[PDB]
Amino acid sequence: MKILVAVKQTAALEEDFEIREDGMDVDEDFMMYDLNEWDDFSLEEAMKIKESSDTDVEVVVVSVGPDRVDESLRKCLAKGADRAVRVWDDAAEGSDAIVVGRILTEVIKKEAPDMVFAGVQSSDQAYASTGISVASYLNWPHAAVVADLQYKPGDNKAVIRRELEGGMLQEVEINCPAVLTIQLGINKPRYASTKPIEEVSLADIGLSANDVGAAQSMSRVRRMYIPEKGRATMIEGTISEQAAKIIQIINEFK
Amino acid sequence: SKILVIAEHRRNDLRPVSLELIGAANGLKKSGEDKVVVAVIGSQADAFVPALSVNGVDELVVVKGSSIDFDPDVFEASVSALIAAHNPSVVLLPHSVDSLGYASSLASKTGYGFATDVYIVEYQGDELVATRGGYNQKVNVEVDFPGKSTVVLTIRPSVFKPLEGAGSPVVSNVDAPSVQSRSQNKDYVEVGGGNDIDITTVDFIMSIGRGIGEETNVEQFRELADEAGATLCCSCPIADAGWLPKSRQVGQSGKVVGSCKLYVAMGISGSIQHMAGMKHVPTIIAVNTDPGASIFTIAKYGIVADIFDIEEELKAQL
Ligand SMILES: Cc1cc2nc3c(=O)[nH]c(=O)nc-3n(C[C@H](O)[C@H](O)[C@H](O)COP(=O)(O)OP(=O)(O)OC[C@H]3O[C@@H](n4cnc5c(N)ncnc54)[C@H](O)[C@@H]3O)c2cc1C
């Protein structure tokens, strides 16, 4: 019994970041990398299944990305993931959610897991597309925005609750194997902030440059830019006077 | 050309984002001759023809599939068939929980353009140009769709303005393609949790986010809210952790604070999904030690200071 958890190492930007010369991306000098927040919850859900079962459950994390990603993978192993796999070649640079979905699917075909988990979305790009793209290439049952999972290893159905707008959930019975995208709050990840990573090339999974990268993506980046955004009226000075202004705002309100 | 819009309904009610999409479609199109086709999918979806017989709709297609409300297998097959029938240049879906279940699957199978959570769309000549966010909304990413005869976009809710007035679409009925879904919808659920206060009704809110740190810090903000005559609300990390009831959560998956005139956002970064719940509030104060927090881009007043230092001084002064 195996659960495959697709994970992304996301980039967050430092203050005073700049757009790079080509105008196509932010300058990498301003990026800080860490595991996608949704992936903490997905991984913990796989581990909960592993702990609840007398039967062995192999938890495999997989990421498509350059060598910086190994740090995040190493940390997943330390939290109890059984195996970690990084897929990359330089030709994969600029692969969108749908191409990433393709690449992940080539690993998954070989791993032949019983369930696939992915995050609802990435904190950086927030495509909310990658996991459901994987479901398409696998031609598997799927559900997005899963807030609860009732599933025993080997079962041919699961019961999930999707988290809807406006404070409601929906129970859905879904055939397994399935792809689920996992929402914040499904569980309380346990480790909240020398087995190696398995390194896989595009060749290892039957792909080449012509299958991946920006040329195969479903849209083309024209530019990336810092838009003019709304500006608050900033209250400077001491805490006493900042609080004094708040109270005046409250009083003006009533 | 045709622009295809996929409407959305749940629990017998049309979701208003449906009309924002029609507004977007009508704005987007290149000539008066182009047509907007709206589809509504459901086993009981004829019920929605009145609410979708509105300004800007040229054709209205009722698709009867196997499920009452959203099913990803039914929707994907149905929307694929609509695209075949209407050969739309652009297909507009809402960037909603339902759409997240299928939109990227629909685009994986086919040679369609695709982008999600789009908040600017226009034609430059014959070229469709869409803008979405990058790096947790710190940049705009402007994209196009070279050589794509059909582009599928999911559209950010509450950005595009609906049209006013009735309309007189040509109404048709089609059956969805006949394939068995791999899932079955069961109960809707409103989970447990206190509900002493309907936060859609209240006019003064102090809201706390992850910046409060540990649960032991909630009490002092509850006391502040009480001393101020505000209702204590939160962002999702706080409710997910069980520190306040889900009935107090503000945003897309929580509630919209429709009656709120003053919202004090403390230790909340201003994620899109939080903003969905409170961006309309006529006076927002943000108190946050990160000047680059998204919340400052909608706040009237910003204070870049420690929330505990501000809370204690506010309490003293009050
Ligand atoms: C489908 C979906 C639906 C969602 N629905 C909702 C929803 O309904 N509501 C919602 O809230 N979220 C929703 N989200 C979650 C959302 O993406 C974010 O995870 C969330 O809003 C972040 O909450 P936060 O701002 O409290 O936390 P963070 O983004 O971590 O922000 C914490 C803030 O605290 C500040 N801070 C830290 N220490 C201090 C200090 N001492 N003094 C002052 N400031 C401090 C930081 O600078 C930071 O800006 C949804 C997400 C998805 C994908």
Ligand SMILES: Nc1ncnc2c1ncn2[C@@H]1O[C@H](COP(=O)(O)O)[C@@H](O)[C@H]1O
């Ligand atoms: N490069 C990647 N490698 C592995 N999984 C990924 C990658 N990119 C996205 N994902 C998965 O998709 C989710 C993020 O969603 P999205 O916003 O569509 O990228 C993550 O939590 C992962 O489960």
